Amino acid sequence: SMAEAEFVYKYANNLPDTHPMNIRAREMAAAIKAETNGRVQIDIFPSNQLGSDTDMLSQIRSGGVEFFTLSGLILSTLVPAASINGIGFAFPDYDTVWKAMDGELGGYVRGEIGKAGLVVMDKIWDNGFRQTTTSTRPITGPDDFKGLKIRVPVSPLWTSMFKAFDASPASINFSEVYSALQTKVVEGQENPLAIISTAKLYEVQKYCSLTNHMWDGFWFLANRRAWERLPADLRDIVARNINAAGVNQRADVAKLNAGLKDELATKGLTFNQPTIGPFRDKLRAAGFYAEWKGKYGEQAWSLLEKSVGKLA
């Protein structure tokens, strides 16, 4: 038989194999294997094949897997600073997002991730600005969130935000979301359009409300020991290829989130665009911005403010 590659590394993720994350990860793995002359093989385990997000967070820490893409908000139980990009209504556009995440704010978060003992690639991958879906009624204003049994990912930031909206959040890994919606364990969830599409959540929801309540992405994490075990030449090749795949993935995801509404509207989702201001007002009145300013500290909060104020 053919000898195994010297380094056979596992990359786990939580998304469908049809999402740009996985399309680009497959291109990335092929490029890496060729460029390292067969020395590095990245085996990809999409859509929670090896386990759920909370499981994989444990595994990237312990070395059970070598690579894992993860929202900073989920990561934030280990790295408290890493939820900072998810502050409600903070970023007005992608322009400010990438300048921040590829600039000083992202540098700050990456440094915090390093302090916790993980490696993280320079470029965060996209997920997108998040919308709401339900099987009950549309969300036209913040009053409609009262009592809503809404699924959220496991994170203090998501819990805080949806409690501030007077909803009843349930913390559930993405792997259980389709079934939880289908069976009405929960009444709704929130995610970018590209997720609603690729995970077919339109099959098990009726309404999509464009609440546009945060932007979030996926840090590309590496187990530190496994990263350091790669010789320097291979490390450089792997890092370059992961970041290149990320840049392409961002471009793919931006196009999907910009254009998917019309397609989703003919697949079993009825859309509405609520007026956004009252939602931001509700988070303010609930003390959400004051809470998180306190938790992140003045320096980090000032860095977030600097980041979102850009006009270009």
Binding of residue 191 to ligand X2X (CB under 6 A)? yes
Among 47, 71, 76, 85, binds ligand X2X (CB under 6 A): 71
Could you tell me which residues come within 8 angstroms of residue 42 by beta carbon, excluding any fewer than 6 positions away?
9, 10, 11, 25, 28, 29, 32, 33, 67
Of 158, 23, 16, 190, nearest to 87 (Cα)? 158
| Residue 156 burial by Cβ neighbours in a 10 Å radius (0-12, 13-18, 19+) | middle
Nearer to ligand X2X, 76 or 191 (CB): 191
Q: How far apart are CA 47 and CA 128, in angstroms?
A: 18
Nearer to ligand X2X, 37 or 58 (CB): 58
With contacts defined by CB under 5 A, name the span among 37-45, 57-65, 66-74, 271-279 that binds Cl ion: 271-279
Binding of residue 174 to ligand X2X (CB under 6 A)? yes
| Binding site members for (2S)-2-acetolactate | 14, 127, 130, 151, 191
Nearer to ligand X2X, 183 or 299 (CB): 183
Nearer to ligand X2X, 157 or 234 (CB): 157
Binding of residue 153 to ligand X2X (CB under 6 A)? yes
How far apart are the two ends of the chain, measured CA to CA in Å?
Answer: 57
Q: How far apart are CA 151 and CA 173, in angstroms?
A: 9
Joined together, the tokens standing for residue 290 give 């004051």
Nearer to Cl ion, 183 or 275 (CB): 275
Parallel/antiparallel/unpaired status of strands 215-222 and 125-129? antiparallel
Q: Find which of Cl ion, ligand X2X, none residue 273 binds, CB within 5 to 8 Å per kind.
A: Cl ion
Among 49, 58, 182, 273, binds Cl ion (CB under 5 A): 273
Written as one string, the DSSP assignment of 83-137 is: GGGG-TT--SSHHHHHHHHTSHHHHHHHHHHHHTT-EE-SSPEEEEE-EEEESS-
Q: Find which of ligand X2X, Cl ion, none residue 187 binds, CB within 5 to 8 Å per kind.
A: none
Binding of residue 25 to ligand X2X (CB under 6 A)? no
From the CB of 177, what's the least distance to ligand X2X, in Å? 7
Q: Find which of ligand X2X, Cl ion, none residue 129 binds, CB within 5 to 8 Å per kind.
A: none
Q: How many CB atoms lie within 10 A of CB 126?
A: 28
Binding of residue 271 to Cl ion (CB under 5 A)? yes
Q: Which residues bind ligand X2X (CB under 6 A)?
A: 14, 71, 127, 153, 174, 191, 195, 216
